[PDB]
Amino acid sequence: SYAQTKTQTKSGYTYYTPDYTPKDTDILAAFRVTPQPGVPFEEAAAAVAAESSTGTWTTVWTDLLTDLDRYKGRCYDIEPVPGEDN
């Protein structure tokens, strides 16, 4: 085994985001969510944020003629309900 440290050169050139901070001019909503067995919590929350806003999982030629981040609802916080499963 031989490990090395490096310096490098660079060539250069979507619904659940917990990093986002809510704005003062935003509509906020609280949902009590119950998923089906075998579905993750973060997957279920991303599905609700998508289906209540724009949907659009597959990109079409019409979708590329507009901004995608501008008109999009996003989930920013998940909190568990005490004494309850899923």
Partner 1 sequence: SYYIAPRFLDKLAVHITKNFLNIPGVRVPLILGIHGRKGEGKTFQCELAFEKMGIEVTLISGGELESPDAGDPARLIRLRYRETAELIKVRGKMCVLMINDLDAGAGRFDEGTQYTVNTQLVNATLMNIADNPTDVQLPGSYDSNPIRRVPIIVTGNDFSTLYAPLIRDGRMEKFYWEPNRDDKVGIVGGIFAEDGLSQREIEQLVDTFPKQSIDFFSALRSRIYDIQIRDFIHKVGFERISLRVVNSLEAPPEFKKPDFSLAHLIESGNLVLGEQQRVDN
43: three-class secondary structure by DSSP: helix
Determine the Cα–Cα distance for residues 42 and 37; give it in Å rounded to an integer.
Answer: 14
Give the nearer residue to partner 1 in terms of CB position, either 22 or 39.
39
Determine the Cα–Cα distance for residues 46 and 73; give it in Å rounded to an integer.
Answer: 10
User: Are the C-beta atoms of residues 56 and 63 closer than 8 Å to each other?
Assistant: yes
Give the nearer residue to partner 1 in terms of CB position, either 30 or 80.
80
How many residues sit close enough to partner 1 to count as binding (CB under 8 A)?
A: 25
**Binding of partner 1 by 38 (CB under 8 A):** yes
Residues 6+ away with beta carbon under 8 Å from 72: 15, 53, 54
**Binding of partner 1 by 63 (CB under 8 A):** no
Give the nearer residue to partner 1 in terms of CB position, either 24 or 83.
83
**Binding of partner 1 by 12 (CB under 8 A):** no
By CB under 8 A, name the binding residues for partner 1.
1-9, 36, 38-39, 41-42, 47, 50, 55, 57, 78, 80-85
